[PDB]
């Protein structure tokens, strides 16, 4: 093992000779270390899935929630639930309700994604802020949309995106599998298939949580029983 | 040993090394000069041509403040633009309040005070420019050079930038040989000669000579550019002299 350091490392708000801000680069790779979240967008819905930590049998429920409702139209997934994730979510919630009472109309998903990025450029009020988000929603202009909002205060729209544990091979299988033609059921099976591969081959309703956005029901997180029949549908469909 | 890293600090000599380093930025700039005439001021500069793609009529090195103050600078280009904007708004402020054109000495002090303030606080850096400016007012012709420390004096002729050594030496000959003072027409010709003589240290780059003047007889005391046949006559004087 050898050492590869540099004189411009840990430089805050400082360009290196190359024009690099290494702090925001470092923050942007810590997204590899969290719990796995996956988003699939289709003409039928946006599906968000996340790996759940195993819990004591005595735990009846908890306020750890890596998939969160922002609005009826908009849902969100984290790889970590630090104070900065809470700050971004309660900013996104306050941004949604203020737009609703101003225009009598639902916020566009790009405009909400832009708003949580502006919070990270402001640092609340060249620093990174908080954690990677997947942001999913439907609006009448740009349909079903999935965005990666980043600690840098910048973002991209994706057709499918994986964050957290598993990054290189997690997005490698998604670009191999994604179609314009995916049905919603098929997208759910695909996020469960990807979750099984990243989890070193374990899959229960106790370690996979699913959700989707549709126009008709909006954002909903699936019951353990709904994800359990979907896991059985995966287990038979791969064995067939 | 750390006295030269931030702007407020005195070194053990009692000098501000960040202002010593700001005048090194001025010394890397294009050479520019001014001449005080019998009734006015002439300014001249070597405009280095960096490529064919620059729109030739809209890159102008000489800068106009109010209508009677001409201005030129050497060193940082964003810093020169900022002092010229301070200058334009400082002159427009006096013109709005007193209804009369700002005295060149009063204008000079308002800039000197502004630039000196940027030597006080370590929350800022000095300006990396020297400004040569001047004009005609109620008291006649004035020529000023203002430096990164906020230091300024009145001059008979002033030079700053890369060619300043050669230009200062020639300007001393103008002053020695014309001790009554030069006419504005001869000062234009003689300024062209000094910019061509300054460019022979830098012959590797193309340049455009740019001249302006502000004279109570030739221009009614309004600052104007030397254009067409007089510019070409002054070029032909500088070209026979540089042989």
């Amino acid at each position: 093992m050898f050492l590869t350091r540099s004189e411009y490392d840990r430089g805050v708000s400082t360009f290196s000779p190359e024009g690099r801000l290494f702090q925001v680069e470092y923050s942007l790779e810590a997204i590899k270390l969290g719990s796995t979240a996956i988003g699939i967008a289709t003409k039928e819905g946006v599906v968000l899935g996340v790996e759940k930590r195993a819990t004591s049998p005595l735990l009846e429920s908890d306020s750890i929630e890596k998939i969160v409702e922002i609005d009826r139209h908009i849902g969100c997934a984290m790889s970590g639930l630090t104070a900065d994730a809470r700050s971004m979510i309660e900013h996104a919630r306050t941004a949604a309700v203020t737009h609703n009472l101003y225009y009598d109309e639902d916020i566009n998903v790009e405009s909400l994604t832009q708003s949580v990025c502006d919070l990270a450029l402001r640092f609340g009020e060249s620093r990174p802020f908080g954690v990677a988000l997947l942001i999913a929603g439907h609006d009448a202009d740009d349909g079903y949309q999935l965005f990666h909002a980043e600690p840098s205060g910048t973002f991209y729209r994706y057709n499918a995106k994986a964050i957290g544990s598993g990054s290189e091979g997690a997005q490698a299988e998604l670009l191999n599998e994604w179609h314009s033609s995916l049905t919603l059921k098929e997208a759910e099976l695909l996020v469960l298939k990807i979750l099984k591969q990243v989890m070193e081959e374990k899959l229960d309703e106790n370690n996979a949580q699913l959700s989707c956005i549709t126009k008709q029901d909006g954002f909903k997180i699936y019951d353990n029983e709904k994800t359990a029949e979907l896991i059985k549908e995966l287990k038979e469909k791969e064995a067939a | 040993t750390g006295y030269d890293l931030s702007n407020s600090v005195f070194s053990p000599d009692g000098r501000n090394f960040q202002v010593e380093y700001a005048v090194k930025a001025v010394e890397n700039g294009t050479t520019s000069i001014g001449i005080k005439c019998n009734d006015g001021v002439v300014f001249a500069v070597e405009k280095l041509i960096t490529s064919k793609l620059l729109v030739p009529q809209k890159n102008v090195k000489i800068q106009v403040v109010d209508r009677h103050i001409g201005c030129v600078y050497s060193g940082l280009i964003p810093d020169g633009r900022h002092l010229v904007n301070r200058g334009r708004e400082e002159a427009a402020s006096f013109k709005k309040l007193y209804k009369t054109p700002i005295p060149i000495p009063a204008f000079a002090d308002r800039l000197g005070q502004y630039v000196q303030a940027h030597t006080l606080y370590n929350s800022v850096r000095p300006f990396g420019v020297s400004t040569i400016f001047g004009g005609v007012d109620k008291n006649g012709a004035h020529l000023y050079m203002l430096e990164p420390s906020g230091s300024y004096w009145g001059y008979k002729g002033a030079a700053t930038g890369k060619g300043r050594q050669s230009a200062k030496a020639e300007l001393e000959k103008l002053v020695d040989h014309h001790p009554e003072g030069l006419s504005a027409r001869e000062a234009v010709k003689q300024a062209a000669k000094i910019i061509y003589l300054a460019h022979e240290d830098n012959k590797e780059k193309d340049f455009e000579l740019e001249i302006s003047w502000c004279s109570l007889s030739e221009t009614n005391g309004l600052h104007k550019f030397v254009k067409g046949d007089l510019l070409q006559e002054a070029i032909d004087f500088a070209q026979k002299e540089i042989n």
Partner: protein, 330 residues
């Protein structure tokens, strides 16, 4: 390369960068300790530092800087030896810049260790000079000590100039008679002009600074006069009485009482006079002595290490007792 480097080091001494100046003084003392400050040119009057040494330092540096090695660099031994002999003709120029830096450093807020180091390098330069360069340097230093702008600050480094003068008089006793009569004249001038007329316990006042300079110079020079005090002993004793009548500022009583200590101390002390790199403009170890015999196995030789030393005379002992009982009884 070494006298080009010595010249470039001495030109680069700062008054703001005490850390760089400390590192330049380390270079200067290391060059001085090994090299003789001497001109090795015989009747070779055609050779000159520039056009002999520099052309061999511009070709050699360009050759090694463009990635080639010193092993590839071939030149005549004759061009090389002319480039060496011509290196040695530049020393009087370097010493003028050095004294001019020493008088600039008097005004600087230095540290006791850097001041001590600057004195050591000035003394090691002197012990490395031949009599020709030493006779030049002595006059240059004495001239600057009288004709300077260099004691304007609150609390100057007097030692940087006064230890060098005491070191001149250790090498040559013949300098002391004029330097000791010029100092006591200037002390009388400053005392008559009012120095030490205003009391303060805590400080040397700004009007006292020249009196303190000439008294500390007197204290330092008198410590090294030895058998040369015997020429002007009575004149010094009557001056000591005048000084103990006329000045009574409590900060100056310490400085003015060190005058007898230095006088009596030099009359009874046994110590080394001669520390020269090469003795007395004497012996013959060749002109190839850029190194001071350090590795040359002939360093241990009795004709190299024959030091004159100082052994108190009987006249110097009859004067030491005359000063001691005169002043104490006084």
């Amino acid at each position: 390369h070494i006298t080009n480097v010595l010249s470039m080091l001495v030109s680069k001494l700062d008054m703001n960068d005490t850390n760089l100046t400390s590192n330049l003084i380390n270079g200067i003392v290391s060059i001085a300790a090994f090299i003789p400050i001497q001109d090795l040119t015989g009747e070779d009057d055609y050779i000159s530092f520039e056009s002999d040494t520099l052309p061999l330092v511009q070709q050699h540096f360009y050759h090694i800087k463009c990635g080639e090695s010193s092993k590839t660099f071939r030149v005549d031994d004759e061009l090389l030896n002319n480039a060496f002999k011509a290196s040695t003709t530049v020393f009087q120029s370097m010493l003028k810049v050095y004294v001019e830096k020493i008088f600039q450093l008097v005004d600087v807020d230095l540290e006791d260790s850097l001041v001590t180091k600057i004195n050591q390098t000035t003394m090691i330069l002197q012990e490395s000079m031949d009599d020709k360069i030493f006779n030049y340097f002595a006059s240059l230093l004495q001239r600057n000590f009288w004709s300077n702008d260099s004691f304007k600050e609150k609390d100057p480094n007097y030692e940087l100039v006064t230890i060098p003068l005491a070191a001149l008089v250790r090498r040559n006793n013949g300098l002391s008679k004029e330097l000791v009569r010029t100092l006591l004249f200037h002390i009388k001038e400053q005392i008559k002009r009012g120095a030490g007329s205003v009391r303060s316990t805590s400080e040397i006042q700004q009007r006292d600074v020249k009196l303190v300079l000439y008294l500390t110079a007197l204290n330092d020079v008198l410590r090294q006069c030895h058998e040369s005090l015997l020429e002007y002993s009575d004149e010094l004793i009557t001056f000591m009485k005048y000084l103990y009548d006329n000045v009574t500022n409590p900060p100056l009583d310490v400085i003015t009482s060190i005058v007898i200590h230095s006088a009596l101390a030099t009359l009874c002390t046994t110590e080394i006079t001669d520390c020269r790199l090469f003795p007395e403009d004497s012996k013959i170890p060749e002109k190839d002595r850029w190194g001071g015999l350090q590795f040359d196995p002939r360093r241990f030789d009795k004709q190299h290490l024959s030091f004159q030393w100082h052994v108190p005379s009987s006249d110097e002992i009859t004067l030491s007792i005359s000063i001691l009982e005169s002043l104490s009884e006084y």
